Amino acid sequence: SMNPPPPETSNPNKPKRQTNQLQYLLRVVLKTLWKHQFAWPFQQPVDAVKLNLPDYYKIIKTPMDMGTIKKRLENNYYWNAQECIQDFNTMFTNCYIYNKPGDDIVLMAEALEKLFLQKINELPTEE
Ligand SMILES: COc1nc2c(Nc3ccccc3C(C)(C)C)c(C(=O)O)cnc2cc1-c1c(C)noc1C
């Protein structure tokens, strides 16, 4: 089995918290990206077996995807907004590292990232 286990989406020992910033990240940021027409390749972990990408998990050692992020938010896995923002950045970065500049998947990622940055620019203050 050449896929690694997916990133954890819950952990009984990791402290849980709900902030208005994390609620914004689920209700506005994640929702906006999730339903976007280019979202689908990013909605679940990269299945390197089914996609026939043997070298993927030899190159990408910190995988991340929006399915994982969605579940983390729904499970109150994050303590703060920065943890979640970091996961989005990891997802985009992995795509830019593994794929060639100008590839369709890169253009899809760039479009989602632009939308992401717009919404993060409008992050609300802590209540
Ligand atoms: C190439 O990047 C991906 N492609 C798919 C994918 N389809 C696919 C397969 C080969 C070539 C091109 C594609 C397109 C997405 C451009 C159509 C599928 C699928 O067909 O179900 C699923 N997950 C992916 C993740 C990725 C992906 C992401 C996201 N980041 O790196 C990779 C690699």
Side-chain angles (χ1 to χ4, degrees), residues 40-42 44 46 51 53 56 95 98-99 105:
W40 63 269
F42 305 89
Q44 62 286 308
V46 173
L51 301 177
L53 302 174
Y56 185 79
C95 186
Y98 181 78
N99 303 284
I105 193 69

PDB file of all heavy atoms in Angstrom, residues 40-42 44 46 51 53 56 95 98-99 105, ligand 1:
ATOM      1  N   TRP A  40     -12.143  20.517  -7.033  1.00  0.00           N
ATOM      2  CA  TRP A  40     -12.244  19.066  -6.902  1.00  0.00           C
ATOM      3  C   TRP A  40     -10.917  18.295  -6.738  1.00  0.00           C
ATOM      4  O   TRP A  40     -10.871  17.339  -5.960  1.00  0.00           O
ATOM      5  CB  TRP A  40     -13.128  18.464  -8.010  1.00  0.00           C
ATOM      6  CG  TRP A  40     -12.598  18.648  -9.390  1.00  0.00           C
ATOM      7  CD1 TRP A  40     -12.856  19.684 -10.248  1.00  0.00           C
ATOM      8  CD2 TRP A  40     -11.711  17.768 -10.078  1.00  0.00           C
ATOM      9  NE1 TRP A  40     -12.175  19.497 -11.426  1.00  0.00           N
ATOM     10  CE2 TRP A  40     -11.469  18.326 -11.350  1.00  0.00           C
ATOM     11  CE3 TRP A  40     -11.101  16.560  -9.744  1.00  0.00           C
ATOM     12  CZ2 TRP A  40     -10.634  17.716 -12.283  1.00  0.00           C
ATOM     13  CZ3 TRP A  40     -10.278  15.958 -10.672  1.00  0.00           C
ATOM     14  CH2 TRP A  40     -10.053  16.534 -11.929  1.00  0.00           C
ATOM     15  N   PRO A  41      -9.825  18.712  -7.420  1.00  0.00           N
ATOM     16  CA  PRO A  41      -8.572  17.972  -7.209  1.00  0.00           C
ATOM     17  C   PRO A  41      -8.003  18.146  -5.795  1.00  0.00           C
ATOM     18  O   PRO A  41      -7.144  17.362  -5.371  1.00  0.00           O
ATOM     19  CB  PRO A  41      -7.609  18.595  -8.232  1.00  0.00           C
ATOM     20  CG  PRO A  41      -8.482  19.299  -9.210  1.00  0.00           C
ATOM     21  CD  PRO A  41      -9.634  19.798  -8.394  1.00  0.00           C
ATOM     22  N   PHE A  42      -8.491  19.168  -5.094  1.00  0.00           N
ATOM     23  CA  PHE A  42      -7.992  19.532  -3.767  1.00  0.00           C
ATOM     24  C   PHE A  42      -8.926  19.088  -2.634  1.00  0.00           C
ATOM     25  O   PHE A  42      -8.636  19.343  -1.469  1.00  0.00           O
ATOM     26  CB  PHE A  42      -7.781  21.047  -3.700  1.00  0.00           C
ATOM     27  CG  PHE A  42      -6.881  21.581  -4.785  1.00  0.00           C
ATOM     28  CD1 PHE A  42      -7.406  21.972  -6.011  1.00  0.00           C
ATOM     29  CD2 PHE A  42      -5.517  21.687  -4.583  1.00  0.00           C
ATOM     30  CE1 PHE A  42      -6.581  22.448  -7.019  1.00  0.00           C
ATOM     31  CE2 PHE A  42      -4.687  22.175  -5.584  1.00  0.00           C
ATOM     32  CZ  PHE A  42      -5.221  22.547  -6.806  1.00  0.00           C
ATOM     33  N   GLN A  44      -9.650  16.118  -1.457  1.00  0.00           N
ATOM     34  CA  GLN A  44      -9.272  14.887  -0.769  1.00  0.00           C
ATOM     35  C   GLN A  44      -7.776  14.675  -0.932  1.00  0.00           C
ATOM     36  O   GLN A  44      -7.168  15.265  -1.818  1.00  0.00           O
ATOM     37  CB  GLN A  44     -10.045  13.692  -1.345  1.00  0.00           C
ATOM     38  CG  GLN A  44      -9.791  13.403  -2.822  1.00  0.00           C
ATOM     39  CD  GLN A  44     -10.452  14.408  -3.746  1.00  0.00           C
ATOM     40  OE1 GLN A  44     -11.647  14.674  -3.637  1.00  0.00           O
ATOM     41  NE2 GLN A  44      -9.671  14.986  -4.647  1.00  0.00           N
ATOM     42  N   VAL A  46      -4.207  13.382  -2.093  1.00  0.00           N
ATOM     43  CA  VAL A  46      -3.736  12.877  -3.378  1.00  0.00           C
ATOM     44  C   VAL A  46      -3.618  11.355  -3.307  1.00  0.00           C
ATOM     45  O   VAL A  46      -2.864  10.820  -2.493  1.00  0.00           O
ATOM     46  CB  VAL A  46      -2.378  13.486  -3.766  1.00  0.00           C
ATOM     47  CG1 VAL A  46      -1.823  12.824  -5.025  1.00  0.00           C
ATOM     48  CG2 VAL A  46      -2.522  14.985  -3.988  1.00  0.00           C
ATOM     49  N   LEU A  51      -3.945   7.778  -9.250  1.00  0.00           N
ATOM     50  CA  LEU A  51      -3.501   8.782 -10.222  1.00  0.00           C
ATOM     51  C   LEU A  51      -2.190   8.406 -10.915  1.00  0.00           C
ATOM     52  O   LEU A  51      -1.720   9.137 -11.791  1.00  0.00           O
ATOM     53  CB  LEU A  51      -3.364  10.151  -9.554  1.00  0.00           C
ATOM     54  CG  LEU A  51      -4.633  10.705  -8.904  1.00  0.00           C
ATOM     55  CD1 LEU A  51      -4.315  12.026  -8.223  1.00  0.00           C
ATOM     56  CD2 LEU A  51      -5.764  10.881  -9.908  1.00  0.00           C
ATOM     57  N   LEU A  53       1.007   8.234  -9.765  1.00  0.00           N
ATOM     58  CA  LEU A  53       2.060   9.192  -9.444  1.00  0.00           C
ATOM     59  C   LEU A  53       2.988   8.587  -8.386  1.00  0.00           C
ATOM     60  O   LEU A  53       3.004   9.046  -7.244  1.00  0.00           O
ATOM     61  CB  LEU A  53       1.440  10.496  -8.921  1.00  0.00           C
ATOM     62  CG  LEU A  53       0.443  11.220  -9.829  1.00  0.00           C
ATOM     63  CD1 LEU A  53      -0.184  12.396  -9.096  1.00  0.00           C
ATOM     64  CD2 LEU A  53       1.103  11.690 -11.113  1.00  0.00           C
ATOM     65  N   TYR A  56       5.030  10.804  -5.865  1.00  0.00           N
ATOM     66  CA  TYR A  56       4.380  11.920  -5.173  1.00  0.00           C
ATOM     67  C   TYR A  56       4.794  12.004  -3.708  1.00  0.00           C
ATOM     68  O   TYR A  56       5.256  13.051  -3.253  1.00  0.00           O
ATOM     69  CB  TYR A  56       2.849  11.873  -5.280  1.00  0.00           C
ATOM     70  CG  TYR A  56       2.223  13.108  -4.662  1.00  0.00           C
ATOM     71  CD1 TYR A  56       2.184  14.313  -5.362  1.00  0.00           C
ATOM     72  CD2 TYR A  56       1.729  13.088  -3.359  1.00  0.00           C
ATOM     73  CE1 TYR A  56       1.646  15.455  -4.792  1.00  0.00           C
ATOM     74  CE2 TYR A  56       1.184  14.224  -2.785  1.00  0.00           C
ATOM     75  CZ  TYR A  56       1.147  15.404  -3.503  1.00  0.00           C
ATOM     76  OH  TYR A  56       0.613  16.539  -2.940  1.00  0.00           O
ATOM     77  N   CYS A  95       1.439  21.739  -4.242  1.00  0.00           N
ATOM     78  CA  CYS A  95       1.019  21.747  -5.640  1.00  0.00           C
ATOM     79  C   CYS A  95       2.055  22.447  -6.511  1.00  0.00           C
ATOM     80  O   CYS A  95       2.397  21.946  -7.575  1.00  0.00           O
ATOM     81  CB  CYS A  95      -0.342  22.428  -5.783  1.00  0.00           C
ATOM     82  SG  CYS A  95      -1.033  22.340  -7.445  1.00  0.00           S
ATOM     83  N   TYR A  98       5.403  20.149  -6.630  1.00  0.00           N
ATOM     84  CA  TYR A  98       5.344  18.887  -7.354  1.00  0.00           C
ATOM     85  C   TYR A  98       5.117  19.082  -8.856  1.00  0.00           C
ATOM     86  O   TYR A  98       5.698  18.361  -9.673  1.00  0.00           O
ATOM     87  CB  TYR A  98       4.261  17.972  -6.769  1.00  0.00           C
ATOM     88  CG  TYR A  98       4.190  16.646  -7.480  1.00  0.00           C
ATOM     89  CD1 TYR A  98       5.119  15.646  -7.222  1.00  0.00           C
ATOM     90  CD2 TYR A  98       3.217  16.408  -8.446  1.00  0.00           C
ATOM     91  CE1 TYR A  98       5.071  14.435  -7.893  1.00  0.00           C
ATOM     92  CE2 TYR A  98       3.162  15.202  -9.121  1.00  0.00           C
ATOM     93  CZ  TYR A  98       4.088  14.218  -8.839  1.00  0.00           C
ATOM     94  OH  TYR A  98       4.029  13.020  -9.518  1.00  0.00           O
ATOM     95  N   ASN A  99       4.282  20.053  -9.214  1.00  0.00           N
ATOM     96  CA  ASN A  99       3.889  20.258 -10.610  1.00  0.00           C
ATOM     97  C   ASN A  99       4.716  21.345 -11.295  1.00  0.00           C
ATOM     98  O   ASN A  99       5.339  22.179 -10.639  1.00  0.00           O
ATOM     99  CB  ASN A  99       2.396  20.585 -10.679  1.00  0.00           C
ATOM    100  CG  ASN A  99       1.534  19.499 -10.051  1.00  0.00           C
ATOM    101  OD1 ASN A  99       1.333  18.436 -10.637  1.00  0.00           O
ATOM    102  ND2 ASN A  99       1.033  19.756  -8.843  1.00  0.00           N
ATOM    103  N   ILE A 105      -3.213  22.226 -13.340  1.00  0.00           N
ATOM    104  CA  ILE A 105      -3.420  22.089 -11.892  1.00  0.00           C
ATOM    105  C   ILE A 105      -2.815  23.264 -11.121  1.00  0.00           C
ATOM    106  O   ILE A 105      -3.372  23.695 -10.111  1.00  0.00           O
ATOM    107  CB  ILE A 105      -2.891  20.739 -11.346  1.00  0.00           C
ATOM    108  CG1 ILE A 105      -3.391  20.483  -9.911  1.00  0.00           C
ATOM    109  CG2 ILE A 105      -1.372  20.671 -11.395  1.00  0.00           C
ATOM    110  CD1 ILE A 105      -4.877  20.216  -9.823  1.00  0.00           C
TER     111      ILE A 105
HETATM  112  C1  LIG B   1      -2.273  16.800 -11.422  1.00  0.00           C
HETATM  113  O1  LIG B   1      -2.723  17.194 -10.123  1.00  0.00           O
HETATM  114  C2  LIG B   1      -3.735  16.493  -9.575  1.00  0.00           C
HETATM  115  N1  LIG B   1      -4.582  15.895 -10.364  1.00  0.00           N
HETATM  116  C3  LIG B   1      -5.578  15.219  -9.708  1.00  0.00           C
HETATM  117  C4  LIG B   1      -6.552  14.518 -10.479  1.00  0.00           C
HETATM  118  N2  LIG B   1      -6.536  14.551 -11.868  1.00  0.00           N
HETATM  119  C5  LIG B   1      -5.428  14.706 -12.744  1.00  0.00           C
HETATM  120  C6  LIG B   1      -4.527  13.649 -12.882  1.00  0.00           C
HETATM  121  C7  LIG B   1      -3.447  13.758 -13.740  1.00  0.00           C
HETATM  122  C8  LIG B   1      -3.253  14.903 -14.478  1.00  0.00           C
HETATM  123  C9  LIG B   1      -4.136  15.965 -14.372  1.00  0.00           C
HETATM  124  C10 LIG B   1      -5.231  15.906 -13.512  1.00  0.00           C
HETATM  125  C11 LIG B   1      -6.189  17.125 -13.452  1.00  0.00           C
HETATM  126  C12 LIG B   1      -6.667  17.459 -12.035  1.00  0.00           C
HETATM  127  C13 LIG B   1      -5.515  18.402 -13.983  1.00  0.00           C
HETATM  128  C14 LIG B   1      -7.424  16.867 -14.312  1.00  0.00           C
HETATM  129  C15 LIG B   1      -7.566  13.840  -9.770  1.00  0.00           C
HETATM  130  C16 LIG B   1      -8.648  13.063 -10.441  1.00  0.00           C
HETATM  131  O2  LIG B   1      -8.675  12.935 -11.660  1.00  0.00           O
HETATM  132  O3  LIG B   1      -9.530  12.524  -9.650  1.00  0.00           O
HETATM  133  C17 LIG B   1      -7.538  13.880  -8.369  1.00  0.00           C
HETATM  134  N3  LIG B   1      -6.656  14.505  -7.628  1.00  0.00           N
HETATM  135  C18 LIG B   1      -5.656  15.186  -8.275  1.00  0.00           C
HETATM  136  C19 LIG B   1      -4.701  15.858  -7.483  1.00  0.00           C
HETATM  137  C20 LIG B   1      -3.725  16.521  -8.171  1.00  0.00           C
HETATM  138  C21 LIG B   1      -2.665  17.266  -7.456  1.00  0.00           C
HETATM  139  C22 LIG B   1      -2.820  18.341  -6.553  1.00  0.00           C
HETATM  140  C23 LIG B   1      -4.061  19.007  -6.062  1.00  0.00           C
HETATM  141  N4  LIG B   1      -1.661  18.764  -6.130  1.00  0.00           N
HETATM  142  O4  LIG B   1      -0.688  17.948  -6.763  1.00  0.00           O
HETATM  143  C24 LIG B   1      -1.327  17.062  -7.539  1.00  0.00           C
HETATM  144  C25 LIG B   1      -0.470  16.112  -8.290  1.00  0.00           C
END
